[PDB]
Every structure is written in C-alpha cells, then in structure tokens.
Amino acid sequence: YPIINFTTAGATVQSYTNFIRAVRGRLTTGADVRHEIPVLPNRVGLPINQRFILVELSNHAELSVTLALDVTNAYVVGYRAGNSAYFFHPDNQEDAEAITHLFTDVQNRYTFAFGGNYDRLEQLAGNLRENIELGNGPLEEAISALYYYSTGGTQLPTLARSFIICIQMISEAARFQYIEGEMRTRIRYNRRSAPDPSVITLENSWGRLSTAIQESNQGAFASPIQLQRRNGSKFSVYDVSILIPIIALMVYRCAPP
C-alpha cells in the first residue's frame, strides 16, 4: 500500500497543503468525477491491493505512527506503532476480513472493542468534538498518545480523543477544502481551537451530500440539505454549485446513467 508521510516537526501551511493534496491524490483515481467533484472508488469489486493507503505521522519527539485509511470512504480503520497494530471493531464481515491484509509485519495485532464512529469515540473520550481543540500542537500530542498506547502509558479516554483529532485533520480535511482551510488557519497562526458548528455540520453531512449530489437532477436536489455557518445559524442548500468549492471527495453511492 502507498505511503504518504507528514511530520508536525517543521509543519508549515505549505507542507500541510501538500500532505492533503497527496492524500486526495491517493484516494481517488480521477476516473469518476461528477459535477466537478471526484468520487471515491466503489467498494464492490475493488481488489484488496488498492483498498487502503497508509498515512505516517511523526512529531518533534521523533515518535512515529502509521494510520491506515480505507480508500472507499477515507475512513481511518486502525494504525501501527512500533511492533503493534490496533484496529477499530469492524462493523461487518467483509471489513473484518479486509483489515487482515494491513500491517502483516507486526507481531501484535489488537482489535478494539469499539468502533471508529464519532459517537462512540466522543463517549469514550468524555468529550464532544466541540470541546477537543485542533491544531499542530494537538496533532503532536495525539501522535505521542497514539504511540505510547502500545507501551502502555496512555489511558483510553486520551486514546479516543487522539483519534478524534487525527480523523479530523486528515480524513475530514481530505474530504472538504473548507475543513482543510480551517486546519490551515490554525497552523498559520499557531492556534489551538475546537472546530466551529460549520465544521461539525459538514462532517456529519458528508454522506448525505454525497448522495444528494450524485442522485440529483442536473445539480438540483430533491430535498434540501441543511448546513451551518460559523456563527451557528442555518442555511439550506438546494443546488450543487455552491458545494463545488466545498466538498473535495464524495463516497460512491450509485452509478452514472
């Protein structure tokens, strides 16, 4: 599997922008673009040698961790630190078998009891995405937390909080230029800050938006999708045009006519 690497060490707005550009490039094949937005590969019929990409994060402390993302949805399914590998509890027979092909080297493979969804993760963290800060600092801390869970010096609440950070600054970033910019802003000014309502909303609506756009009538939606602004106020989207500069990746929903 391909390997993109990013270090928070000399982390810069450019290095971060290249990193994400690299992740989006490895997720899609350019074969399927609708209304100018790339679509992710169809899960059914995809060989396991093109099923995952490996992101390797490293920080100042010289600690390193490797996240594994499922290409069909940009989902962080697990990771490797040192000689061990941890996976989120798969939620269907197929996925369970698929992950088997990741990190075949490692001597110790553990599968968490919980899933990687936000709900479950927020619960375990004892925090809501609205209270967990994002930024380069938080990314460094998350990498450390992630690394030491293998040695035994990281509590579960902290592990979960670390996952919520990586998933957002990497997966959600690849999915939305809007969110990538948000992260770029934090790095630019050395800010540590929880995501705004608009970010949380875009995250929770990816699936819905992917569907609305793909099964739309010439860009027109059959049902409006409701989104939030930074200040929290709502607004409805009825057409695909306004989304074109916001969504970078879409999960496959159906085939084109």
């Binding site: 630019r188 000014y189 009538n217 602004r229």
Partner: protein, 259 residues
C-alpha cells in the same frame, strides 16, 4: 446500489439580480410570456418549476417553451404536447447555464428590470444568462479568503486582498455575479478578456460576461467567458491588484469561501 435514479424536484429558478423565472400574471394560456419577477414567498405555481426527467421545465403542468431557434425570440408557457417537441427541451449546466439543445441558444434576461420578458440569446456566459434552481431566494454572503490567508476586500471602485478583520463580506448571486454586501448593485467586474486586465467594482448594470464568475473545485474563481481566473498580481498583496490571468494553480490563484 443500482444506477443513480435522478428525481424531479419542484424548485424556483433565480437569475439576474436575484429575480425569479415567472409566468406572467399567473395565467397559463398557450403563448403567455415568461418573465423575471421579484421572488415570492408562497406557493403560486406560476413561480415554481418542476425539472422533469425528459428534460422539460414545467410550471403548473405546462412547458417552458421557446418561440423559435433564433437569437431574440421570447420564452413562453405552452401545452407540452401541442408545442414543437424539441423547443421544450433544456439542459441545466453546473455553471448556471440553461440551454436549448437544438439551437444552442440560452435562456436570457436582456434586462434586469422587474417584468422583463425572457428570451433565448447566443451563449456568451453573461450575467444576463446565469440561473440557479433553488428555493433559496437570497444570495450567499461569505468571506473569500486567499493568498497568505488574506481576505478579498472592496473599497468603492477597487478590490484587493488584505488582512481579515471579522466590508470584506460578499454576496454570491444566482446570476453568477459576486457583489459587495454593502452595495448589492455593484459587481466584481473585469473590463476585458485580456491576460492582465485589473478586476474592479463597477455597476452590475450591463450584466456583462466579464461580471460572471464561478468557483471551481480546484479553488479557483473562473471567468467563464474568458477562461481566465482571479489572480493576485505577482503574489504581492502589496501591489493591491487582482487581475485576470491564465490558470497555473499557484497559491495566488486559490481562494476559499469562508462561511
């Protein structure tokens, strides 16, 4: 799962100056004119359109029909069966164009006045030819962020980039224009289609093709007619100039609508 099943949404069609595609005086006799008209908050069928799968746009059961296949003829409402089959056919493009595939003429509003009759003109990607299927009558107000994290700002007749102080708020209209929130009858304009014309802020009056833009997926703001993109001259915010320029994709051509 299955092949994508497209629907048939009932929606309004907003265009020039935020006005709506309207069936004149709510009457539906064959031939009655289609016009621009202040959008209404209610359920009068004369302002609601159904995008049928067969490529016809219908209001209250009738078809949006073109009088002929020549620049200048008007658009009318008409019985879908009685009318010339491919005169009721249209395609709604992602870049806000509604085209009659047959004559290649576009739905247009050669006037921004309330009550103007719709016609089909030659496609030149003008603001007088931009539309949007939406129940959303108001324009989208945002902050456009660019090079070095700076914001797009307007100070009367000119526009440049500067540090973001939370007017730098812009309204994105259905007709494809980008207007400064404080003076909504002013457009982000570009005099020519030449490789360096300095983008300015003039009145939306002419609704020219140099006043229509589109935010692409790659983070650029494209001028549909010229093929050029907003560019911060020589990556130098100091020069205080935004120009039209061919696409290369460096940081000085990338923008983001921060809402």
């Amino acid at each position: 799962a299955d092949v994508c099943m497209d629907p048939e949404p009932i929606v309004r069609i907003v265009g020039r100056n935020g006005l709506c595609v309207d069936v004149r005086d709510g009457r539906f006799h064959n031939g009655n004119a289609i016009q621009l008209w202040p959008c209404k908050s209610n359920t009068d069928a004369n302002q609601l359109w159904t995008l049928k799968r067969d490529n016809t746009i219908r209001s209250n059961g009738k078809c949006l029909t073109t009088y002929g296949y020549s620049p200048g003829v008007y658009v009318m409402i008409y019985d879908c069966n009685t009318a010339a089959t491919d005169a009721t056919r249209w395609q709604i493009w992602d870049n806000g164009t509604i085209i009659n595939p047959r004559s290649s003429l576009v739905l247009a509003a050669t006037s921004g006045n309330s009550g103007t009759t719709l016609t089909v003109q030659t496609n030149i990607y003008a603001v007088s030819q931009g539309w949007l299927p939406t129940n959303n009558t108001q324009p989208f107000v945002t902050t456009i962020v660019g090079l070095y994290g700076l914001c797009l700002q307007a100070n009367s007749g000119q526009v440049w980039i500067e540090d973001c102080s939370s007017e730098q708020q812009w309204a994105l209209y259905a007709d494809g224009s980008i207007r400064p929130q404080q003076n909504r009858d002013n457009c982000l304009t570009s005099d020519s289609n030449i490789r360096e014309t300095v983008v300015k802020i003039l009145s939306c009056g002419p609704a020219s093709s140099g006043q229509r833009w589109m935010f692409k997926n790659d983070g650029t703001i494209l001028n549909l007619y010229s093929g050029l993109v907003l560019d911060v001259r020589a990556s130098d915010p100091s020069l205080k100039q935004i120009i039209l320029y061919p696409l290369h994709g460096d940081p000085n051509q990338i923008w983001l609508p921060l809402f």
